Amino acid sequence: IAAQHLADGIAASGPAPDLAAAAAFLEMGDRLGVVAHLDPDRTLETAEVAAALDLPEPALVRYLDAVESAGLVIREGEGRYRACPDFDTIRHQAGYISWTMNANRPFIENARDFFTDWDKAARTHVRDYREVAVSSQWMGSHAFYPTALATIIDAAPRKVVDLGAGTCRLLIEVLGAVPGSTGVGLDFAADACRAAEQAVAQAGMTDRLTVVERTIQSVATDPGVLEGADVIHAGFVFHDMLPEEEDVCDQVLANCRESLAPGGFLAITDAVPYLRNDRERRFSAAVSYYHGEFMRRRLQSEEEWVERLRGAGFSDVRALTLAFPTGRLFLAH
Amino acid sequence: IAAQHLADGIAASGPAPDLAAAAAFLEMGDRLGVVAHLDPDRTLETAEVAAALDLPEPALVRYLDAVESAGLVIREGEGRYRACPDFDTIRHQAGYISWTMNANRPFIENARDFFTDWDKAARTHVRDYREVAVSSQWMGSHAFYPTALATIIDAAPRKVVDLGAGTCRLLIEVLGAVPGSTGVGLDFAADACRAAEQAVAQAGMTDRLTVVERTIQSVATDPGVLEGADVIHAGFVFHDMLPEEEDVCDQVLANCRESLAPGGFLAITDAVPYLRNDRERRFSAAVSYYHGEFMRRRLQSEEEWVERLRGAGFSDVRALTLAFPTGRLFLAH
Ligand SMILES: Nc1ncnc2c1ncn2[C@@H]1O[C@H](CSCC[C@H](N)C(=O)O)[C@@H](O)[C@H]1O
Ligand SMILES: Nc1ncnc2c1ncn2[C@@H]1O[C@H](CSCC[C@H](N)C(=O)O)[C@@H](O)[C@H]1O
Ligand SMILES: CC(C)CC(=O)C(=O)O
Numbered sequence A, B: 001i002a003a004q005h006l007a008d009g010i011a012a013s014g015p016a017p018d019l020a021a022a023a024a025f026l027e028m029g030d031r032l033g034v035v036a037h038l039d040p041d042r043t044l045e046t047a048e049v050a051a052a053l054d055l056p057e058p059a060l061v062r063y064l065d066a067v068e069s070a071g072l073v074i075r076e077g078e079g080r081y082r083a084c085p086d087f088d089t090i091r092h093q094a095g096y097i098s099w100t101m102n103a104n105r106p107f108i109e110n111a112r113d114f115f116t117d118w119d120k121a122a123r124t125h126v127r128d129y130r131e132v133a134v135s136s137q138w139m140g141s142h143a144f145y146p147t148a149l150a151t152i153i154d155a156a157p158r159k160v161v162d163l164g165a166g167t168c169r170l171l172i173e174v175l176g177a178v179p180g181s182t183g184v185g186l187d188f189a190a191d192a193c194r195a196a197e198q199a200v201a202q203a204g205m206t207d208r209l210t211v212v213e214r215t216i217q218s219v220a221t222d223p224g225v226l227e228g229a230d231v232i233h234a235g236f237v238f239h240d241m242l243p244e245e246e247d248v249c250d251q252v253l254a255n256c257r258e259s260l261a262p263g264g265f266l267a268i269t270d271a272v273p274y275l276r277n278d279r280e281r282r283f284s285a286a287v288s289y290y291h292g293e294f295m296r297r298r299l300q301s302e303e304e305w306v307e308r309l310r311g312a313g314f315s316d317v318r319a320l321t322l323a324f325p326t327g328r329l330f331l332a333h
């Protein structure tokens, strides 16, 4: 009678309460630096972490107790905590909410301004690239790193280069899997680079993996970074020079064709626009609208990407569907 | 082989991509003023709405085309659009994400500051109460209005008062259901009040439903607003005077006991702290942490609320479980 109001409410809400909570807790925690210490297989030692993160130990404890109540962490002893068993899936899902609602917040809040004067708006309302890079890492863990990772592990490379590498997770994983390998991760944002270095350091690969703060446009006139490369990867960057710097794009591509050690290949994970299929359409639209309207970057269809890679020297070019909606992996030898 | 990477990715992502997209689209749209015109049973006429919202018609069209691609709206003709059939459920779910990630953003971003100097932080990092009120309306539609609404429709009241009424949706619904009734909605935030007036006006109840901009603390010394009331409701406000203004709280309660027309009752929908049950625990924790740590407002358990209402003059007090996690409806005659 009001028990049916209960059942119908629960069904209408579905998984949104759980996800809303997880996303807020994890973004707050990641900004504090706490989340990097949360793993289902490792312990977080409050005495040490509080001191490393320069937080009052009592404050950290109240946070972790809140997250314990939430069911996201387990208290092992006093000042010892570990993530819940399914933590990595929960964090992955929170990646999508963080990306749309956090990284892209300036577009949500100031749409009026973008509509009436784009140029003034584009330079007034700027995204935090630390947030851009972290949220994409969380999405990538399960939805776009695995395919690219598995492709790269085969043909056991020696040298791997990643353009627009963000927090450098793919390289950390590649280098962890192939025993004797080197990596260089290139990214134009101080905030991302700083975060990448800390993550690389934490993974104890500081000497094998170089973080260089440069544009991808840089590589057009300065391919001194590529050569000797078995694999070159670029994840969601190539679009940041379209449709304006088209010539510079085709120049970076040509440079990649040359610098490649004779066996290897260019791997591009990127986003195609406005898909129609039921599974991808909704998040497709969000990625496409943010890119087209707010960032004025051109997303190319599957067809167009294949054409571009061909008429830039590469042959044997195929495209793969990724779990990430509108995400596609292009392999070009 | 990479088709299993696909299946496993899709399963790991689950409904998070769809929800992330919906939440971003709808918050952006609501800030523009577009979402109030989206209904599965009504049409949005771009020529008129663009002019009413003072937007360039082309800009509105590109938004609506993006949302059409997303599957959230249907294009009826040229410059005519309607919401998808399940729009109201999608908006309801987006309410939770908007609440945790948007309304409460100052707490997510500046946790460090709250940890080290609470007083300076509390007055530097302030929530937008327009966002607080709208997001709670979206959550309430399916998860806390229905029970309170059905209780109030019985005993067909003449006069209904709602303390901390926000965007005044419950009153609009109550007044829509009982043919000859009056309402007054009280709320301390200019931004919420302004939004309520516009919504009341849109529902053509402008003369029946009064919006008064006052505190709930106001009512302690000035019960001239209550008397002649068949029902007094307060949804998620009573906590905003605990644990500091405890005396003023018990004074507002006593005032409610008197002013009630002899048949009627006080109805309190509010939030209890840190539930443990599997269904409620995660979002429970988020509501509880934001309230306890960031806002320093005291949430009372079910037991405590019943006790308070009793030793304030009311008898026949029961508590009902709501679909909204940690939400409980208290009826006090
Ligand atoms: N012109 C440019 N040159 C280099 N990096 C760029 C760039 N424009 C944007 N970027 C970077 O590209 C990244 C986009 S998202 C991060 C992608 C990362 N490879 C991942 O898959 O997880 C950001 O780190 C951003 O700072
Ligand atoms: N001391 C106070 N007096 C009156 N209203 C208050 C208040 N403190 C907060 N509020 C208001 O209480 C609301 C909390 S959330 C909105 C609740 C609304 N009744 C609903 O269920 O949808 C906000 O609108 C906020 O501005
Ligand atoms: C699509 C995202 C994964 C990356 C991106 O392009 C961006 O955030 O700008």
Ligand SMILES: CC(C)CC(=O)C(=O)O
Pocket (backbone or CB within 6 Å): B132, B136, B236, B237, B271, B287
């Ligand atoms: C719990 C919410 C519905 C309302 C609230 O108390 C708030 O946002 O402050």
Ligand SMILES: [Zn+2]
Pocket (backbone or CB within 6 Å): A236, A239, A240, A291, A297
């Ligand atoms: Zn981009």
Ligand SMILES: [Zn+2]
Pocket (backbone or CB within 6 Å): B236, B239, B240, B291, B297
């Ligand atoms: Zn509150």
